[PDB]
RNA sequence: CCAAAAGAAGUCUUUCUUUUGGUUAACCAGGAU
């Protein structure tokens, strides 16, 4: 959703996230 | 003691059995495994090992 | 009797057969030349190939190896591919599914080796389990489901019978069996539809053949009138030509009844040929039967939210009555613990009574193919309680199924009980290796080397007690304990002559005559009083479990009882210990946990209820010495045989005062070698009876043996 | 184009009609594509002849029982169903079987006319007692394959006339069955194994002629679109 | 309930093998000392002749030796004496 | 496999527990790693429990004690305040679900919610007491378990071996992205660091299976050479090919070429594959399976595998080891292959 | 040398040198590497694997022809057994095989005078999806079964006006073997498997003759070298279990450690005489040496 | 009841690579069998044409890169695995394809000799740049079925050459139906509906008359028992 | 018991003679059923 190019992947998701998942490898 | 030496507690069982002397006679399955020969069970036993196989005099006279 | 193997495998183990044989037929000159032909794949090594393993046997093996039925002979036949084929009817006794297993593949050299492997070995030679008897070659999983299917009734099917109207005469009433299979390739008729049919190679019922034909049987070629449906003559079309029309639902049950039947009667050829009829049979109506799965299928209750709010009524009252100080907090937790599983059963109740009989789900579960219901309530209705890391279930409870998909905290919950489970099983697996182990090294010298000590002590067998109104009832547990038997005394009931002799093989028929003639207790032969010096005889020991006869005289039965008993552990799921500690507890001969100590001499005893601990007193009939246990910690209970200990009661010299343990030592000390033997047996067999697993007594016999054989000096 | 390794076609005998032909070897994959069209082939294409119905004097309402006769109505029926009939006129031509007096009645005892033949004159039918008398007429017509009960088309024109299934294909039970074969390398050939079973109007041999026949006559019309199509050849016998 | 042909290894039907002999244990020795005898027999049959006589049934194209034994055992015409 | 790898936490090593020594109240599943290790996620051997995998969202302060964070409710409302917490701070306060019904304005719709106690307990509470929420589901679950669909419909024990599976599954010539997944596969693919992605925005200069030229805004010129059939670890291939033309513009951060198991930047395990749900003849008894011979004729599951073969040169006290032709006993038909110098 | 079963194409020679001044270990003169690379299909026995749990090897690769097709003609790909599913408690694949088909053909809900109830909170630009269509349900927040039944009910045709799955999610399947359709319908779906790391083809071994160890004469271990199945002391229990006494002796002698026995049991296999009989191990004499190097006066009597 | 009236088969053509055979009157249940055989038939034993194995100047092995085209040696081997070509001699034919500069490489570059053509010539292989530079040679070969790649050094080959999976099979999906008719009155039969569909190799007439002339040979084996 | 070289015979590629050469272990880690 915030990568500049990504495929569009639509989502079945009913909530919204307040935090994005922080870098994988910190 | 060879059984037992192969069971468990290796170090006791050698060192006790050389101190007492211990004369093995190789009568178990697990001894005449391990020493190469025909265990004692089964097909191994003198009744069965020892059959003399034959023909008939019958067949030998057709043959 | 067959397995596949990969020709490039096989080219591999038989190089040097297949080399000779090359030299023989003038396609080498010399062994080099066919040596380099081999390694060089020419096109007639394999034709050479396929005549050298005609009839020769190789040993397939997994590891691990836990009984006897984990290395069996197969014939090798060619097979293209890396993987080796294996027959899947030996799946159960190798213990081996195909999500990933391996193999291992000997070869057999010499005339005596390759004898012993299509004597001894052959796979089809071993059809019943030596541990229990029962067939470990039977149909299961898909097999039972085709089977299922194909012997289904129907009403209202597709060309039924129907009676004569008066204006037509009677539908569904073919002339053969062959006459019925046209008609259901044309869609007229179903396979599990009601039918009269006209059998004449099929032999009738015992009932039917003695109202219809008499003088002595039905003489194949004579015919009779079945009603039936078509699936059924199918079916029995597969099972020898002199057994019975069998006219019933193949359930699983029935199944093994019928194998254990044709094993018991038939020779081991028959057997084995019925059972390859039946896989065939089985696998071609399970692709028919329509079982799929489908989130449409997994029908969910109707009424589930009524039930829930109704306790849910009831868990708030209980949290209320809490709340106000009416009970604490262990109070609490029972009380809801109770209701929720009132409520588990509720919901289980209802969707089983939901579902219809033709859902893929329930027909899966219960034709005995696999699974049960609590698995079905779990994925449709409801889960429940879950347990803590600790163990005591949480009040929550889980209130969802999988269907409708857990929560967060229901699935966090969850993982609990999942990762015990797990860890459990592999410290399970560890364990029974290792008990397996010490097993067979404690008894590999017990071997049957007579055929009689012709002796006249033995065990007596509780053998169907009496009722108590007047009336015998079999006891439940017969198969495993008197069953396999050799008697040591004759029967005799009410001065009536001898109903059995002595030295009779005691199966079903002289146990039926047994209890007709009404008699509760026989002595039979057994291990444990043997006169031989060395090793057991072969009356004493009695049938062998998995040739069906009297054991031979070379049988290593020390070897058989230990992986019998070792084999079911894994299996046997986990203060007073009731899992697979409590068996090597048991064979150790090490003090229980809980020791629970037992009476010295029978009279009346005093009990003073002491703070923090008992005090029991055991006052002697005959007056010389009381027997004091004073610490008798408080936790544990006071035993109830027959109301619980009363100040005063009557104590046997054996019985047992407290609930728990009592400790072998002790019970040897005070009664005697026999009644030992028989606490020892019992204690073992109860957490394999409890787990649901079948071992016969003779097997523990043996060990227990083994555990009494020397005896310490007091007295130089 | 070749096929490389040409089948074969061989018997074994077991019963006076009852056969076990093997083919072998052919392709891998041609073991089903031939075997279950020939099963159907020998079971739904062979011209044959049956009893399409009877009518049997004093039964005309109550289908329960025959006066002076022993066995029951459907009993009669399922026996004259298994009766092995041969005939050449396409019309529905009538036969009539009567015999007074106690004794057995016996297939022989019908009178066929011109042209109807029967092949197992020694099949028991029925018993008479006590001076009974038994007289039905049976209707041959000959079809093919197996035809259900044909459901009165007019009441009015019989009464008595019960309709009865027709089995007029002379082989009455077929299986196949595919195995594998070959030490060249692929042992993963095939090898079917037919078993067909027929009547005594007919050997199997014969049976399997005519479904070859007809199964080569069907294809002729798949083959006819364009003569010069390349195909696989298995070359002269 | 007659059974069907047995097929490869699993003829001769082991029942009737079994009832000529006490026990399996015998009948391994039986046909395992008889396949030896064979097997001398074919490798001195070019070389000078010696007591080892045999088969006594006839022989397939390619019959392994022991297989042959067994076939002779079901017909009944050897005798064993056990130890 | 790689990323999982990195964010594993061992509790056997140098100063900790040992494999065969370690007893069952060690393996088990404490009520505090809610969020801050996966409770799935975990060997299936002897190594169960003592082997765990980071959840996404927590991190490590400075004294080693993992944190997680909760959005914290005011007064009843939902703020969008998030504070880091330890296992203490946790255990303190009442934790309520991220599922819960939110009215648009940060307000339950119903008074009574689960929450979580200070042992862990759970119970409902009238919305007043509640004193933080997670800050979404799929934070009790690490990077491997968020990529299983539908995973609340699955026991823990088989998604257990469903996660421990997808870190074995090897990279494939051609890559297809599930048609059905869960999101996660973008970042995670992103993260691993197999593809590669550009550094600042600029317009393509050229593309080749070699290399991509990327023309920044003010002047300068970047290259990016891509890793060709090169071996990684485990003897697998590690392919890298541009998904960009001659002319796109690409912004940074963008992705800008696939890698091992990647279709378009997304992580792409396996395919897509048309299934039936029957048993068919007991060639898929026993948990076996059949597949169509389309999959071998198409090569829609073929893969390529690379082998390092390894020889030196050493001194020795006699001295001159030599790479040569020149090899006694051994003839010429075997030296044909071997070029002028070995 | 390029060890036992290996084999494949040479793609990379990598050289080094110590006349080029590289670094390497010290002592070396010359390094030298050498890459071979294989192209691997699938093939029996291979491992696959899906997303929920549900492995297993594949038993058997049939033909396209021979496959149950849908009605257009369309073979399925791959088959799993039903059995398996509701007894492990991984329902969820059955879902994703549900919604793998509507993300294939492609929906559209149809909003013609009111959206339906079931679709009330289905997010926007969900209502209608183009066939091969990618979605995505978060790991504990997705589909919900109403939505899933729904999407079912409301999908595209393929190329004529043919439903071929119906709102149950089952198709009518034709057995390609024998040409009749199956009975029953069926439930087909698209379901994403993966290539599991367990391949035959480096799990497949035998030996005949090769190597043996050096201080005891036994075989060698592993595939690189050759080396035999080993014959534990659990296996060696069965067959004293089964009686088996002269093939637990040629195992342990004459196929391990016999010395002599080896090269003579081989010799008369080569040349058809009867096998002779064995010696004594080589491990108990390499034992009895062991015992006297600890001071212990082990002795052998008759 | 002996209906004497024979089969006849009809065509009916929905488009040029696609059509529907209708055969009636079939007995009453021998519809779904010769479907099936028909379509077992069509989906394995007709036999074409394909590449067998490709040279490029510039490689030595699959798995290397060309200068200047973006995909590799991979995906090029890929992409031409697409190709339908029809051949009409039995010996193996070589065809080329040269290009140079920037552009696309299409099926309608390579060159065939006489009597092998191409019947897809809007086929994408490669995308080349400035740098680019591409020249491959490929062989066709007849036959049946699908034959793995041929090894190396089975055949005497140079390093440069690269053998290629073949897949000989001009069907692409072959289907059917059948119409039942049963009547009341016992006289019943069916009606085979055939939907074959080809890859523009060859028509569908084509490949039906390859399975019947399969077909007839099978079963004249049997019939000539007598 | 294999490989290389030389000599003789024949076959168009096998045999005979002489010379030379010619297998490991233990730890740690990671997986599988
Ligand atoms: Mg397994
Ligand atoms: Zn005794």
């Known amino acids: ?26 | 003691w060879l059984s037992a030496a192969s069971f468990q507690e290796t170090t006791r069982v050698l060192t006790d059995a050389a101190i007492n002397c211990r004369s093995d006679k190789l009568n178990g399955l697990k001894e005449n495994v391990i020493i190469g020969k025909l265990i004692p069970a089964g097909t191994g036993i003198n009744r069965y090992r020892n059959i003399a196989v034959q023909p008939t005099e019958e067949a030998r006279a057709a043959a | ?716 | 184009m070749l096929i490389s390794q040409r089948p074969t076609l061989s018997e074994d005998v077991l019963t006076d009609n009852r056969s076990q032909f093997v083919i072998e070897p052919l392709e891998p994959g041609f073991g089903y594509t031939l075997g279950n069209s020939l099963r159907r082939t020998l079971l739904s294409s062979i011209p044959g002849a049956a009893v399409t119905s009877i009518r049997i004097d004093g039964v005309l309402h109550e289908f329960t029982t025959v006066p002076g006769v022993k066995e029951d109505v459907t009993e009669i029926i399922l026996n004259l169903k298994s009766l092995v009939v041969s005939s050449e006129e396409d019309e529905p031509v009538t036969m009539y079987l009567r015999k007074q007096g106690p004794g057995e009645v016996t297939a022989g005892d019908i009178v066929p006319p011109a042209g109807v033949t029967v092949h197992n004159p020694g099949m028991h039918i029925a018993t008479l007692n006590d001076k009974g008398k038994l007289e039905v007429e049976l209707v041959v017509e000959r079809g093919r394959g197996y035809v259900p009960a044909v459901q009165n088309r007019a009441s009015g024109a019989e009464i008595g006339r019960i309709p009865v299934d027709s089995i007029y294909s002379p082989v009455l039970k077929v299986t196949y069955k595919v195995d594998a074969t070959r030490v060249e390398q692929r042992t993963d050939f095939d090898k079917l194994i037919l078993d067909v079973e027929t009547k005594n109007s007919i050997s199997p041999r014969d049976a399997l002629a005519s479904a070859g026949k007809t199964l080569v006559e069907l294809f002729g019309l798949a083959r006819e679109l364009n003569v010069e199509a390349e195909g696989i050849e298995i070359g002269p016998s | ?83 | 496999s790689g990323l999982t790898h990195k964010r594993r936490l061992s509790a056997l090593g140098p100063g900790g527990l040992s494999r065969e020594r370690a007893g069952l109240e060690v393996r088990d599943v404490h009520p505090s790693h809610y969020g801050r290790m996966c409770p799935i996620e975990t060997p299936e051997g002897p190594n169960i429990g003592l082997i765990g995998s980071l959840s996404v969202y927590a991190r490590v302060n400075p004294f080693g004690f993992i944190e997680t964070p909760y959005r914290k409710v005011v007064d009843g409302v939902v703020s969008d305040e998030i504070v880091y917490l330890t296992a203490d701070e946790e255990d303190r306060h009442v934790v309520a679900q991220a599922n819960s019904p939110i009215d648009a304005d940060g307000r339950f719709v119903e008074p009574r919610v689960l929450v979580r106690r200070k042992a862990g307990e759970v119970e409902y509470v009238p919305s007043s007491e509640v004193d933080y929420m997670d800050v979404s589901p799929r934070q009790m679950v690490s990077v491997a378990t968020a990529m299983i669909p539908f995973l609340e419909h699955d026991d823990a024990n088989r998604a257990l071996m469903g996660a421990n599976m997808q870190r074995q599954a090897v990279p494939l010539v051609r890559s297809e992205a599930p048609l059905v997944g869960t999101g996660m596969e973008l970042r995670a693919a992103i993260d691993a660091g197999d593809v590669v992605v550009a550094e600042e925005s600029g317009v393509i200069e050229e593309v080749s299976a070699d290399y991509i030229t990327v023309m920044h805004d003010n002047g300068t010129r970047r290259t990016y050479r891509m890793r060709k059939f090169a071996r990684s670890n485990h003897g697998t291939c590690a392919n890298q090919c541009p998904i960009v033309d001659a002319g796109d513009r690409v912004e940074a951060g963008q992705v800008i070429a696939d890698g091992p198991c990647t279709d378009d930047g997304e992580m792409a395990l396996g395919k897509n594959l048309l299934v039936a749900i029957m048993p068919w003849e007991g060639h898929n008894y026993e948990d076996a399976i059949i597949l169509s011979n389309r999959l071998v004729e198409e090569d829609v599951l073929t893969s390529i595998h690379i082998e390092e073969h390894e020889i030196d040169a050493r001194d020795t006290k006699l001295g001159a080891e030599e790479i040569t032709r020149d090899i006694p006993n051994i003839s010429d038909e075997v030296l044909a292959d071997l070029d002028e110098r070995g | 040398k390029v060890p036992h079963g290996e084999s494949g194409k040479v793609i990379g020679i990598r050289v080094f040198s110590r006349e080029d001044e590289d670094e390497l270990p010290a002592g070396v003169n010359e390094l030298v590497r050498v890459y071979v690379a294989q192209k691997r299909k699938i093939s029996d026995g291979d491992k696959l694997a899906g997303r929920h749990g549900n492995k297993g090897v594949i038993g058997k690769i049939l033909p396209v022809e021979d496959m149950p097709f849908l009605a257009d003609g369309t073979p399925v790909d791959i088959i799993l057994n039903t059995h398996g599913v509701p007894r492990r408690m991984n329902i969820g694949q059955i879902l994703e095989t549900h919604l793998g088909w509507c993300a294939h053909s492609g929906w559209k809900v149809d909003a013609a005078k009111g959206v339906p109830d079931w679709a009330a909170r289905l997010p926007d630009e969900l209502l209608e999806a183009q066939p091969n269509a990618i979605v995505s349900t978060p790991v504990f927040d997705g589909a919900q079964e109403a939505e899933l039944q729904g999407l079912l009910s409301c999908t595209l045709p393929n190329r004529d006006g043919d439903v071929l799955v119906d709102a149950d999610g089952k198709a009518m399947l034709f057995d390609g073997r024998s040409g009749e359709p199956f009975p029953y319908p069926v439930t087909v779906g698209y379901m994403y498997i993966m290539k599991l790391h367990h391949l035959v083809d480096d799990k497949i071994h035998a030996r005949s003759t090769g190597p043996y160890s050096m201080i005891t004469q036994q075989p060698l271990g592993g595939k690189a070298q050759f080396g035999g199945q080993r014959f534990g002391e659990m296996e060696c229990w069965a067959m004293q279990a089964y009686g088996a006494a002269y093939t637990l002796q040629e195992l342990l002698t004459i196929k391990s450690d016999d010395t002599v026995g080896r090269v003579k049991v081989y010799e008369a296999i080569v040349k058809g005489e009867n096998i002779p009989e064995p010696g004594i191990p080589e491990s108990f004499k390499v034992l009895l040496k062991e015992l006297q190097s600890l001071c212990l006066n082990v002795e052998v009597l008759s």
Not at chain 3, 415 to 424: I, S
Not at chain 3, 539 to 563: F, P
Not at chain 3, 564 to 576: A, R, Y
Not at chain 5, 22 to 38: G, N, W
């Open chain 3, 1 to 716: 009797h067959q397995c596949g193997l990969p020709k490039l495998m096989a080219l591999e183990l038989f190089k040097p057969f297949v080399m000779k044989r090359l030299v023989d037929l003038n396609h080498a000159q010399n062994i080099k030349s066919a040596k380099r032909m081999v390694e060089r794949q020419r096109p007639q090594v394999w034709d050479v190939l396929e005549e050298v393993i005609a009839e020769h046997p190789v040993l397939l093996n997994r590891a691990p190896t836990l009984h006897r039925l984990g290395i069996q002979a197969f014939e090798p036949m060619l097979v293209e591919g890396k993987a080796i084929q294996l027959h899947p009817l030996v799946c159960e006794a190798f213990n081996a599914d195909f999500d990933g297993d391996q193999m291992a593949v000997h070869l057999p050299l010499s005339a005596e080796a390759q004898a012993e492997a299509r004597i001894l070995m052959l796979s089809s030679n071993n059809i019943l389990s030596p541990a229990s008897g029962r067939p470990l070659a039977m149909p299961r999983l898909d097999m039972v489901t085709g089977l299922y299917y194909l012997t289904t009734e129907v009403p209202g099917d597709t060309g039924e019978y129907q009676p004569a109207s008066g204006d037509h005469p009677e539908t569904g009433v073919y002339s053969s069996p062959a006459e019925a299979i046209m008609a259901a390739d044309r869609g007229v008729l179903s396979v599990r539809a009601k039918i009269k049919v006209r059998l004449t190679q099929l032999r009738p019922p015992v009932e039917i053949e003695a109202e219809l034909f008499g003088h002595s049987g039905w003489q194949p070629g004579d015919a009779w009138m079945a009603e039936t449906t078509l699936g059924r003559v199918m079916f029995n079309e597969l099972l020898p030509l002199g057994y019975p029309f069998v006219n019933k639902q193949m359930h699983k049950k029935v199944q093994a009844a019928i194998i254990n039947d044709l094993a018991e009667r038939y020779p081991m050829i028959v057997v084995a040929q019925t059972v390859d009829k039946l896989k065939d049979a089985g696998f071609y109506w399970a692709t028919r039967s329509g079982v799929t799965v489908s989130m449409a299928d997994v029908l969910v209750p109707p009424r589930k939210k009524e039930i829930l709010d109704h306790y849910e009524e009831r868990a708030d009252k209980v949290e209320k009555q809490f709340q106000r100080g009416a009970l604490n907090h262990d109070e609490r937790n029972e009380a809801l613990v109770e209701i929720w599983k009132e409520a588990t059963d509720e919901v289980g109740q209802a969707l089983r009574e939901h579902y219809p009989d033709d859902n893929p789900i329930i027909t899966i579960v219960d034709s005995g193919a696999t699974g049960n219901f609590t698995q079905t309530r779990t994925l449709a209705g409801m889960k429940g309680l879950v347990t803590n890391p600790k163990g005591e279930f949480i009040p929550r409870p889980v209130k969802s199924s999988f269907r409708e998909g857990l929560t967060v905290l229901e699935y966090f919950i969850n993982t609990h009980g999942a990762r015990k489970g797990l860890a459990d099983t592999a410290l399970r697996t560890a364990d029974s290796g290792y008990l397996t182990r010490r097993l067979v090294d404690v008894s590999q010298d017990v071997i049957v080397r007579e055929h009689d000590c012709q002796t006249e002590r033995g065990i007596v067998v509780e053998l169907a007690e009496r009722a108590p109104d007047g009336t015998l009832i079999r006891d439940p547990y017969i198969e495993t304990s008197a069953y396999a038997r050799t008697l040591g005394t004759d029967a005799v009931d009410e001065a009536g002559n001898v109903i059995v002799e002595r030295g009779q093989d005691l199966g079903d028929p002289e146990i039926d005559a047994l209890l007709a003639a009404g008699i509760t207790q026989v002595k039979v032969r057994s291990v444990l009083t043997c006169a031989t010096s060395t090793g057991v005889c072969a009356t004493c020991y009695g049938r062998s479990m998995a040739t069906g006869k009297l054991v031979d005289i070379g049988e290593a039965v020390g070897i058989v009882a230990a992986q019998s008993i070792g084999e079911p552990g894994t299996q046997l799921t986990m203060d007073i210990t009731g899992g697979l500690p409590r068996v090597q507890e048991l064979f150790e001969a090490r003090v229980p946990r809980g020791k629970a100590p037992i009476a010295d001499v029978t009279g009346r005893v005093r009990l003073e209820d002491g703070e923090r601990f008992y005090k029991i007193t055991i006052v002697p009939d005959d007056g010389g010495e009381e027997v004091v246990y004073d610490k008798i910690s408080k936790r544990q209970r006071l035993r109830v045989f027959k109301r619980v200990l009363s100040d005063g009661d009557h104590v046997e010299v054996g019985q047992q005062l407290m609930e728990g343990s009592a400790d072998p030592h002790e019970v040897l000390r005070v009664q005697g070698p026999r009644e030992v033997q028989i606490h020892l047996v019992r204690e073992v067999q109860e957490v394999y009876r409890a787990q649901g697993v079948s071992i016969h007594d003779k097997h523990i016999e043996v060990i227990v043996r083994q555990m009494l054989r020397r005896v310490t000096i007091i007295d130089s």
């Open chain 1, 1 to 26: 959703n915030s990568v500049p190019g990504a495929p569009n992947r639509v989502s079945f998701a009913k909530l919204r996230e307040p935090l994005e998942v922080p870098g994988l490898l910190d």
């Open chain 5, 1 to 83: 309930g007659g059974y069907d042909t047995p097929l490869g290894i699993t003829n001769p039907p082991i029942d009737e093998l079994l009832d000529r002999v006490s026990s399996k244990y015998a009948l391994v020795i039986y046909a395992a000392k008889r396949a030896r005898q064979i097997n001398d027999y074919y490798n001195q049959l070019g070389e000078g002749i010696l007591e080892y006589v045999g088969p006594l049934v006839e022989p397939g194209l390619q019959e392994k030796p022991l297989s042959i034994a067994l076939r002779e055992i079901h017909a009944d015409l050897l005798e064993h004496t056990e130890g």
